[PDB]
Amino acid sequence: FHTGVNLVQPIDTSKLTRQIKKLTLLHEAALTVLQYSNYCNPEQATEILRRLPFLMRHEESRVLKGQTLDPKLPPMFHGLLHVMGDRFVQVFSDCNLRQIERGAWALAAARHQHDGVALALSEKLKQLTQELLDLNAKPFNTRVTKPTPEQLNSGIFASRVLVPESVNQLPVKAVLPEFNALAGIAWALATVAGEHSAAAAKAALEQLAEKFGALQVDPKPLPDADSLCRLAWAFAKAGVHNPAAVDKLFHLAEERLKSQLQAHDPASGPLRPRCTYRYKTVRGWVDQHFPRKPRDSSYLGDTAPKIIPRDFEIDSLGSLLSAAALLRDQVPVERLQTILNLAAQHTAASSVAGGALQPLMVTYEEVTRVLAACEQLGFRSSTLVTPLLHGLPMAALSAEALSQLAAAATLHHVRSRTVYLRIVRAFNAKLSVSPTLVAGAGIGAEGKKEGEAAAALGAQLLLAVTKAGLPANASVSRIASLV
Amino acid sequence: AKRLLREAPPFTEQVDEKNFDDKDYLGAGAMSNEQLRKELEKVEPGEAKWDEESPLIPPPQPRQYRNKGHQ
Amino acid sequence: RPIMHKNWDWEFVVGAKAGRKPAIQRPKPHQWYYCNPKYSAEDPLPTKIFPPHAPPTAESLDDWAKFRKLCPKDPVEAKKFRKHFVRFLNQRNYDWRTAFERGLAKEVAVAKAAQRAEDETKRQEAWHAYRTAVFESAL
């Protein structure tokens, strides 16, 4: 039926779908985008947007040991986002709730500002605020057998093969089932909002804050830790002032943290988050609350699950606490203190198995992010810092970073000889002579420190160690002699 | 032939979708070195004892991967 | 040493011009380098073998490093696994040529069509001027 020359469209819809699913490089994506961007339906337009953020990270990792990234790529990555952003606005009226989530996240993830998208999202947010926060609201259903004329405008059903869909039985006694969808859209609106669309975005968010505050029920499945962080930053960036909404949001976060700790038995092992395990099935995908056993398939090459976390982790605690510092004035002190204590308990329990310490690996970026929030909030605790130092590798850190870590441990009253020894030993191996002291570089800091700068770092480390009260050791003695 | 009995081995380009970081955090407005020195000096030299630790502490354990629900 | 060769005689590649070794009619992947009419002994030898049809984005490929990680531990399965990996590598050379030949055909057709339009325009313009002269002459 689709043979010959099409006088209206240059490319067949089915062929265009094949190319989109077959993208692995930005150059290939640019070839598709720059030719057929005006002939994509909402299904195709939003699919491209979601892939672009992942393709950019892939190319940065293709660089070999002795090569460098091509300078022409990053400019092209933002060029493609702008072109797809315009097409997203044109077909915005025909997108589903899920499709709007994909397009909005891609621009927000890439930190690309677009006035046209921000204005379109502002109107949509107002419409969805009164519908998704209603008590008598039902979950989004993918099991569509006879689509309506308006659903034929989404492009999902213009396919020559089976359309994958979720095979779960939708809950029938859920309260506000689509809260997570609303939280993500609001965060995208704040991030994508530009200079000429800031007023509209703020007004839409203010109405959402008032509606959220004037609510006497909690969603039956409590909002995910990620969703809570996104909503908190949506208010912080937009400057919405509503203590009633802010306090309620922190209440939900407090409730979730307690629930995770209450339903945890230490005998089983270290605390781990609850997650959704998604598997591929004949008619689509299925979500489970617990993992399957490893399986060998006769047809699939990969049977591993996609893990979507629902509880809090160290990564999310460094973003929720960051939002709290921005919104400190709107949060009661009592609620802030309770959350801080729960955060410490979550960290301590997550790195203990049986009766012995089992540290969990962390990165330097994560540690600094958590500590920075604590300094702003003025929270001092040794139960939150000690687990973070045991799981932090100290082999590729610069001399400056080691000095800062030692100072932080002393201020937080950390009492663990192993932590102190692992820091001084690493610092000593980085302090070289030649008659000028040289402090090596590393992940922690940029460049090397020579002369007085190296001496200052050594003095700070010695001061922290002296206050801590460590017994004399070879590493400290050599540092003192050099400085 | 053109028809395969199972998925082909992963010899083509593999785009990874795991551990994508897009959260918002604070800035880098940390304290100055002089302020840290003053804070350390203010620390009281409390004569406390060290905690009782196990003779052998295992090295850090890697964390499991995470995905996103924007499928 | 570079990873890929960049100086090719494109008349030879398309087939309008003869090569440096006319006895070879279809060069192999490792024979392209020495059949190039612009071959020079002063140029450093590339560290990898690529045909002239390969894109410049192939310089970041590391195929044997990935193969080792996927290596089965059973020797019987390992031998078959390696045989399929070599088959994949060889086929990739002729996927590039097919795309190369299809891509150029589209560009040629577009240019040929554009020339055809211009020629008709000039012929029609010339006739119109002649027609005008006839009316003017007759007053």
Add this chain to the structure above:
Amino acid sequence: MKRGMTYQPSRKKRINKHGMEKRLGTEDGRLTILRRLEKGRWRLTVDMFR
């Protein structure tokens, strides 16, 4: 069915069945070599080359 295709060449088969190493492995094969030396044939086995 069409006949006349009783020969299906195979290099490994030809060497193993009629090779010099095979002719020298048995008493009867050694006698065959002597018979061909006596007649004075220039090529003794299908396996021979310079």
Add this chain to the structure above:
Amino acid sequence: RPALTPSFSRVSDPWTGEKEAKYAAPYRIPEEVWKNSGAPKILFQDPWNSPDYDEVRKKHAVLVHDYLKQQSQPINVQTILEGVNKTHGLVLGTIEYVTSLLENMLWHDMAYVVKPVFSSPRKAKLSKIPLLYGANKYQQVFRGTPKEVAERYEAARAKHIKVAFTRLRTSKTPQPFRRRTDEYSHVQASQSALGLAAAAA
């Protein structure tokens, strides 16, 4: 740049069904004066096609397609002709030309037609009532109106599930597999660079 027929009543359309030429003489003269005089006809009219014959046809189809998308109910071909001309000016001359454009859209599922119901085949063949046409906002893979498309999709969805499980029960893969063919060569890389330059300019 539409051109008028020698009768100065309509524009000539670019298709094989057009039997009228384009008047191109420098002066306007009635048909009767010069048609029976015996002079060569090529001095007054152009019987050939324009250099942009194919591009003009594609442009006309877009104008018709866009107008239908703006409509809210199926309409006749006569209404389509009047609406397009009023919006843009005198660019289309006959309803037969518009009909040919619509047939192309119907084949590729860019539009649909609403047909009447008749009691017997002979009545349907002899009927002369005009037809009504609509347009799809995006290209579909099924024929008919949105109600018919939904019905066809439902039957297709059931068939797919039936086939997938029968394959699984008989020890076949539920979903067919293929290999990914690399379609990015040096020619494609140069096309992308050319495209960026054109977009920048």
Add this chain to the structure above:
RNA sequence: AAUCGUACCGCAAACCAACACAGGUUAGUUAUUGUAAAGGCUGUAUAAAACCAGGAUAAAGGAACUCGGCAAAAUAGGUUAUGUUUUCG
């Protein structure tokens, strides 16, 4: 890090069939809704005999043909209330 293969033919006028033989010859890959991207290939000069081979159409009749419906032609496909036979499938 040495050593051996790398030209050309390979559903074929170059391999097995005495031939430039309508035969035989393994695996891996590619475009295509009702079609089909790349690539590859190419026939002494005429026509208004009988007859022969391979197709097409045919008034009225419709197995009268013949050892024999040989050959040819033929709505061929799907869903059925009810009935029959079963080793109950």
